[PDB]
């Protein structure tokens, strides 16, 4: 179908306790395949999926030296950011980066991403046209002009259209049986007396890949937990609705997921 | 693979 490569960077300063910690993970769709951690005893990029272990030493060495350089670039960014927000030299701060490419079955670039958060908030992000930036606040506007001047977007778009696309091509080819799979969610509805008056109706979805799923009770009274990973390369989720007794019949759980032919309609058995 | 200098790796905020 339509696939994605994405890298997730986190740089965390810790003034006095040394340099910021830099950590990276890379995903293809919902599957993680590499990690890097500057605090590791022997910092190198490491495989986190079977199908990427195919890459030779040159792959690991170059990616390792690039993370180390990115960490250094992030250190400078964190310095700049601390100035922009007039912050104390003593506080720890967090810079999050996410970038990567979406393609269709065509294998052509469908969409590019290149975004940043600072201390939990959106900072700056590359627009879908890959030629312009959206700054979140007055601070990120400094960065904006800086990159406008330097024509940063073109560098970004270049990678996004070229390397990212190509690399994603290679990984989907090697992880073939395991990247373009589709595991449908196993489902069931549980019932749970809260009182003499009412009970909880909880709708389960288990064992599915990828993580994308929709799940509703037919909202103001619907509890919805975050989709969660199983430790297998699979995901779980459920939805609750507090419901009076002798009344569970007028309630309907609806389940949507790509791995299934029938967008499910469930009542409590 | 992560982006190198041609893709933004040396471009700070």
């Amino acid at each position, epitope marked *: 179908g339509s696939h994605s490569m994405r890298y997730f960077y986190t740089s965390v300063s810790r003034p006095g306790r040394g340099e910021p910690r830099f950590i990276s993970v890379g995903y293809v769709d919902d599957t993680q395949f590499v990690r890097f951690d500057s605090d590791a005893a022997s910092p190198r990029e490491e495989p986190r999926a079977p199908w990427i272990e195919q890459e030779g030493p040159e792959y690991w060495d*170059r990616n390792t*030296q*690039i993370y180390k350089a990115q960490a250094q670039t992030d250190r400078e960014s964190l310095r700049n950011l601390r100035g922009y927000y007039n912050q104390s030299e003593a506080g720890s701060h967090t810079l999050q980066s996410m970038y990567g490419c979406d393609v269709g079955p065509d294998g052509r670039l469908l969409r590019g991403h290149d975004q940043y958060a600072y201390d939990g908030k959106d900072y700056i992000a590359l627009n879908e046209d890959l030629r312009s930036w959206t700054a979140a606040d007055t601070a990120a506007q400094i960065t904006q002009r800086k990159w406008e001047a330097a024509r940063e977007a073109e560098q970004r778009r270049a990678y996004l259209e070229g390397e990212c696309v190509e690399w994603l091509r290679r990984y989907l080819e090697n992880g073939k049986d395991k990247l373009e799979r589709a595991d449908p969610p196993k489902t069931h509805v549980t019932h749970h007396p809260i009182s003499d008056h009412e009970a909880t109706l909880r709708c389960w979805a288990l064992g599915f890949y990828p993580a994308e799923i929709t799940l509703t009770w037919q909202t103001q009274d619907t509890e919805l937990v975050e989709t969660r990973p199983a430790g297998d390369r699979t995901f779980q989720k459920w939805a609750a609705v507090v419901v009076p007794s002798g009344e569970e019949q007028r309630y309907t759980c609806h389940v949507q997921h790509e791995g299934l032919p029938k967008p499910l309609t469930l009542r409590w058995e | 693979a992560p982006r*190198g*200098p*041609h893709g933004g790796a*040396a*471009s700070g905020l």
Partner: T-cell receptor
Amino acid sequence: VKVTQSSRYLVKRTGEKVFLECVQDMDHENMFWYRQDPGLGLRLIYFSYDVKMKEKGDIPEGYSVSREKKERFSLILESASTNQTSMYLCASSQRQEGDTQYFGPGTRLTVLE
Amino acid sequence: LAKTTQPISMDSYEGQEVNITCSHNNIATNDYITWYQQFPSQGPRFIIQGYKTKVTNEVASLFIPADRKSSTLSLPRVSLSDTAVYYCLVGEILDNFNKFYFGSGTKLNVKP
């Protein structure tokens, strides 16, 4: 685009410690020392990607370098030998475009017994 | 070692287009292709760089076929002063990481 070198022609006796200077005024993070020899093209001796930072190139043996300031990258032949007779070419580049390198005018060095 | 291969030398007459094909079969996905021009008694100078899309400037055009296994430097109708060594380089460089190696290049002799 101003990369300079101190010497244009040098004759040295074997055993002498020989100093070659390279200065750029472009605030570049990278500086490089190459030698160019007939048939072999340019071979990297040492590069420096920032003040105080040194990285051996493909042929570091018999050389040292100095990057005590960002502007200047010195090459030292610790104990000159005849096979160090060559054309020495300095270059510099920006961290963000390390493969867009600006070259000095070169130093012809001849070491004799 | 040299990841680029190119002719040691070539001859051309003034007024003719000159094409220089460089081989780089083992080019990595993250490598860029960069060419330098070295006039006699001068250091090389950067002249063109590309990744995949054709590039043209006032000095040259750079052709890169689909697989990026090779690339062609195209000099417009040369004059005698275009006599020089042309280097084809493939690689990546940042901080301590330097996979960016010159090689011997193509000595271009332009004849009157």
